[PDB]
């Protein structure tokens, strides 16, 4: 007559992935992309003070 | 704003010391 055939229900697991804040944007965001123009200024101090020391 | 102030101060000392 009868027996077993399909059984369980209460039993499962799940992993979990993750995205990230957008503002993050490219690494260049404050104190990163400005270092290009901040360097020309610093080269200006170096120079103007080279005039100073000479 | 700090780096600009430093630059201005250095320029002024350069002027004083050319004189």
């Amino acid at each position: 007559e009868v027996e077993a055939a399909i059984s369980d229900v209460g039993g499962q697991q799940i992993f979990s992935q993750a995205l990230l804040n957008a503002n993050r944007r490219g690494e260049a965001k404050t104190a990163l992309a400005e270092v290009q123009a901040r360097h020309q200024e610093l080269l200006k101090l170096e120079k103007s003070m080279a005039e100073l020391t000479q | 704003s700090r780096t600009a102030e430093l630059q201005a101060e250095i320029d002024d000392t350069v002027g004083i010391m050319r004189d």
Side-chain angles (χ1 to χ4, degrees):
Chain A
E1 204 79 328
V2 239
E3 247 141 306
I6 308 137
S7 103
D8 236 29
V9 180
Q12 243 305 277
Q13 309 288 94
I14 76 170
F15 289 80
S16 163
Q17 342 183 199
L19 343 170
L20 228 127
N21 103 78
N23 289 3
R24 181 177 181 170
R25 211 50 3 217
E27 214 4 81
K29 20 117 249 95
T30 85
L32 263 129
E34 85 182 51
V35 186
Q36 177 52 236
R38 198 181 64 208
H39 182 63
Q40 289 175 50
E41 294 151 25
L42 191 159
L43 292 184
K44 179 191 22 266
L45 300 144
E46 228 169 13
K47 268 345 279 137
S48 290
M49 181 274 289
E51 173 178 8
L52 181 58
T53 188
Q54 186 63 56
Chain B
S1 51
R2 189 268 279 273
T3 296
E5 169 63 32
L6 178 52
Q7 179 71 54
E9 188 178 85
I10 289 162
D11 286 345
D12 186 74
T13 303
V14 167
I16 295 162
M17 183 277 288
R18 286 175 166 239
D19 287 345

